[PDB]
Paper text:
In this study, we have taken an x-ray crystallographic approach to study the conformation of Cy3 and Cy5 fluorophores attached to the 5′-termini of dsRNA molecules.
The protein-RNA complexes that ultimately yielded the best diffracting crystals had terminal 5′U-3′A and 5′C-3′G for Cy3 and Cy5, respectively. At the end with the protein arch we observe electron density for both Cy3 and Cy5, whereas at the end with the RNA-RNA interaction no fluorophore density was observed for Cy3, and weak density for Cy5. The electron density map shows that Cy5 is stacked upon the terminal basepair, with both rings of the distal indole stacked over the guanine nucleobase (G58) (average spacing 3.9 Å). The C5 polymethine section sits over the cytosine nucleobase (C26) and the proximal indole is directed out into the solvent. The long axis of the fluorophore is rotated 10° about the helical axis relative to that of the terminal C-G basepair. The crystallographic data show that both Cy3 and Cy5 (respectively) stack on RNA such that the indole nitrogen atoms lie on the major groove side of the terminal basepair, placing the pendant methyl groups on the minor groove side.
Numbering used by the authors:
A (entry chain A): 5 to 43, 52 to 73, 87 to 115, 119 to 135, 154 to 181
B (entry chain B): 5 to 40, 52 to 74, 84 to 115, 117 to 135, 154 to 181
The structure:
RNA sequence: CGCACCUGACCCCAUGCCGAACUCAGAGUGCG
RNA sequence: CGCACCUGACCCAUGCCGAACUCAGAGUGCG
């Protein structure tokens, strides 16, 4: 919720000033965060459900658990990742963009942050201004 | 399909030159065309689109219209017929250039109503895409 | 070997229209 | 009143996700 507010109040106007977008709907915005937890199953699923607030799908060849977060579950999870999880580790790789505006992070737990930016450069600016700790 | 070829060979490079897009996937591109007794209207609409129309029913269940959402090659084939055959044979002043919805999509009615949905984010870019594809604006 | 992106529809499966979605398939981008 | 866009979440929905399907709501476009 706080992270979402930051998007509207702080990030979106700064993106407009930096890239010259003429309308608000053109500005890059997070679309979804996809979490895949590679691989008892019962326990892994309940933990992933607890941390995302969403029921995981079982991916079968059972080799994985997947959630697609959008809207407020997306923002709430991100806020947890940036404020709680990451700072308990011993910053993000700025080259890990897929060439089409999406960021990939592996922790194995793979996370895809999918944005509506069409370029890595704009996606980078969006995620940096949201407080993703790069470099 | 000739209209599709025209998009890739002629329209997309001209949009790149005019608006300065740095990558091909950023260039505006058609996403879909939505076309909105019953037996007869459905058979004709199916024949001209190559697709099965959905029946819109009152939210009573009496039929109040027919809709088809065309994507991909059925979209291009239908458009080519619309631009080359149907529109110029209207007993015709050209399409209204003010009928963009403010978000890059165009609407016209002939009643047969047609929604042309593009990935352009502004009316100005959508206008350029549809003009270069051969939409005949007045 | 997996997920995301990307591109498709012979194939299991699918649209109360649409391979959009769901399903399946395929050799490059990112990550593990 | 409908379709497209847009914004959401009592019928309904996701083999996860209001993405989709469903439903709802002033605005924009078009009937």
């Amino acid at each position: 919720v706080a992270l979402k507010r930051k998007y509207y109040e702080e990030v979106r106007p700064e993106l407009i000033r930096r890239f010259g977008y003429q309308n608000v709907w053109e500005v890059p915005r997070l679309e979804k965060v996809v979490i895949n937890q590679g691989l008892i199953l019962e326990k892994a699923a309940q933990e992933l459900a607890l941390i995302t607030g969403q029921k995981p799908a079982v991916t079968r060849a059972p080799i994985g658990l997947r959630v697609t977060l959008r809207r407020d579950r997306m923002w709430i999870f991100l806020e947890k990742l940036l404020n709680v999880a990451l700072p308990r580790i011993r910053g993000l790789n700025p080259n890990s963009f897929d060439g089409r505006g999406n960021y990939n992070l592996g922790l194995g737990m793979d996370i895809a942050v999918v944005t509506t930016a069409e370029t890595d450069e704009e996606a980078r600016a969006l995620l940096e201004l949201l407080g993703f700790p790069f470099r």
